[PDB]
């Protein structure tokens, strides 16, 4: 579009780091003894409750 930068260039930096760290703590389920989430990607309700 011919712009020099994004509208909020510190915000898009935050977006990447939120992605990276948010992604890591989801992967972190593996290191736990139980493992990651059993329920599929969809994570249907009754199977997901406590």
């Amino acid at each position: 579009i011919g712009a020099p930068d994004v509208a909020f260039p510190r915000l898009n930096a935050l977006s990447f780091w939120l992605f990276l760290f948010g992604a890591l703590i989801a992967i972190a389920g593996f290191i736990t003894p139980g493992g990651a989430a059993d329920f599929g990607w969809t994570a249907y309700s009754p199977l997901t409750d406590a």
Binding site: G2, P4, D5, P33, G34
Partner: protein, 535 residues
């Protein structure tokens, strides 16, 4: 007539003695006003609070293993065999007004003492406040840190407790008794016999109220005297050279701000002693060899030694009819840690080759290898400290205990290397950022050039500008550079009225003009002094 009384007392002092010259020297002594130079003052103030609270605690503490049934006020421990040390610690907690608060603020002051010693050590190591001069100061400071560690170790072990007695049984007994040639002999000399010997707590009480604190006081006196007469080093700056101290004199400003900082530090310690519970010995039953908990950790300053014990991989050697337990491994590890810490300045000077009398600090970025090594060491220390806490880490953060142990084991050789590489590159990139700021000016908002659609950040040079737009690059001078026009004279004059209402325009203009004049005067004074020194 307070003025008359003060004048008469001054005349009396200067007649009985003649301290005018010495007192004037002390008052005129200049101290740099860097915040990182208050880190040692934090430790000093925490030590003073420790002394003041320790006197109060000694007025009520009874060191002895003499068994007694409580028969006190705390109901959940009544009729239970306990030592007089535990009984009187419970008495301080419950049956003495403010005793719980005093012991809690004492323990919090111990924790802050250790933490501030660690932070001060980080400051000096990373800023190079130990090379050529002050190397002996660093050495005695390392001794001081070790003494503080063991002082806290004996302190929280002083009230014979389940947790602290278990910690003693682990470290003091097992490690001491595993040492090959003289281990059992040292154990028996220290404990007057087997582990539960009836003199351990009295001996630790002596060591902890008089002997070790006396040595700490003597070494703190030596430390402060050395800092006083080997004038405090300073970061590179406008008027700061290796043969001067730029800052504020002792009397008007430094003394008042140091006293205020002492007040605020003791306020933080008192607030924590009130609001945060530290070492609930009443919850921690009396020591019994058959009883134990799952936590079993020492204070955070000995947590790295405990983590070393946990992580080291159970390597035992059995010479001819003998045993060399795994305790010797951790003992030698601690010995190496302390030897390296004490001998670093001499190790650094032998390696690099610099024996020049250094009075100007160097920013940690400006010394990539040393900041990298310090980051590596801090990473190893944090790894060990969290390894000691792997039990609670595993419990709360759901990670298998074996997984935490082996994470520590692998990391203690992987994480230090990763942190070393990252810190080295980070320091070099901070240098590169400083150089880019020097050669291009500070960054600002973007502008679209008139004829064509070029985008230029519209920098702001920090030095003389060439005939054309680009400036003459400056040379790095070892001092921080302003990377935001925020921190320069740009958008910094809000209406000086108040938070809710304005002030008259005449008053606002007078105030802002006077402030601008004062800034000009300060900057001009620094510039002229710098020119006079370097010309």
């Amino acid at each position: 007539d307070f003025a008359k009384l003060a004048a008469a007392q001054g005349d009396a002092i200067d007649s009985r003695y003649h301290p005018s010259a010495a007192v004037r020297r002390q008052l005129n002594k200049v101290f740099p006003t860097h915040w990182s130079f208050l880190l040692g003052e934090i430790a000093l103030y925490s030590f003073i609070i420790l002394l003041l609270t320790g006197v109060w605690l000694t007025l009520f503490f009874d060191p002895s293993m003499a068994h007694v049934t409580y028969d006190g006020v705390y109901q959940p421990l009544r009729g239970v065999q306990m030592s007089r040390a535990y009984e009187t610690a419970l008495d301080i907690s419950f049956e003495v007004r403010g005793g719980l608060f005093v012991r809690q603020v004492h323990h919090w002051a111990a924790l802050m003492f250790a933490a501030s010693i660690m932070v001060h050590l980080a400051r000096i190591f990373f800023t190079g406040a130990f090379r050529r001069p002050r190397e002996a100061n660093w050495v005695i400071g390392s001794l001081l840190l070790i003494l503080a560690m063991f002082e806290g170790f004996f302190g929280y072990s002083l009230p014979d407790d389940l947790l602290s007695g278990t910690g003693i049984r682990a470290a003091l007994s097992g490690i001491t008794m595993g040492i090959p040639v003289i281990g059992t002999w040292m154990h028996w000399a220290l404990f007057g016999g087997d582990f539960p010997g009836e003199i351990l707590i009295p001996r630790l009480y002596a060591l902890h109220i008089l002997l070790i604190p006396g040595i700490i006081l003597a070494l703190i006196g030596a430390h402060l005297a050395l800092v006083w007469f080997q004038k405090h080093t300073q970061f590179p700056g406008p008027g700061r050279t290796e043969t001067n101290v730029v800052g504020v004199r002792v009397m008007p400003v430094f003394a008042v701000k140091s006293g205020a900082f002492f007040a605020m530090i003791t306020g933080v310690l008192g607030l924590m002693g009130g609001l945060l519970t530290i070492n609930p010995i009443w919850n921690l039953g009396p020591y019994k060899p058959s009883q134990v908990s799952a936590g079993s950790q020492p204070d955070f300053y000995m947590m790295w030694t405990d983590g070393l014990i946990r992580l080291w991989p159970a390597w035992e050697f059995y010479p001819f009819g003998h045993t060399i337990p795994q305790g010797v491994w951790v003992a030698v590890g601690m010995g190496l840690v302390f030897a390296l810490l004490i001998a670093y300045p001499f190790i650094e000077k032998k390696v690099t080759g610099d024996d020049a009398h250094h009075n100007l600090l160097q920013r940690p970025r400006d010394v990539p290898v040393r900041t990298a090594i310090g980051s590596m060491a801090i990473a190893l220390y944090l790894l060990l400290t969290f390894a000691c806490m792997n039990d609670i880490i595993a419990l709360k953060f759901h990670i298998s205990l074996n997984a935490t142990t082996w994470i520590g084991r692998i990391g203690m050789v992987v994480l230090p290397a990763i942190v070393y590489f990252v810190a080295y590159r980070w320091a070099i990139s901070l240098q590169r950022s400083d150089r880019e700021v020097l050669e291009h000016g500070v960054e600002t908002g973007i502008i679209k050039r008139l004829p064509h659609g070029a985008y230029v950040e519209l920098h702001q040079p920090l030095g003389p500008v060439d005939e054309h737009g680009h400036p003459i690059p400056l040379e790095y001078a070892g001092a921080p550079l302003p990377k935001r026009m925020n921190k320069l004279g740009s958008g910094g004059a809000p209406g000086t009225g108040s938070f809710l209402f304005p002030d008259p325009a005449v008053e606002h203009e007078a105030l802002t003009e006077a402030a601008h004049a004062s800034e000009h005067k300060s900057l001009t004074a620094l510039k002229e002094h710098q020119d006079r020194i370097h010309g």
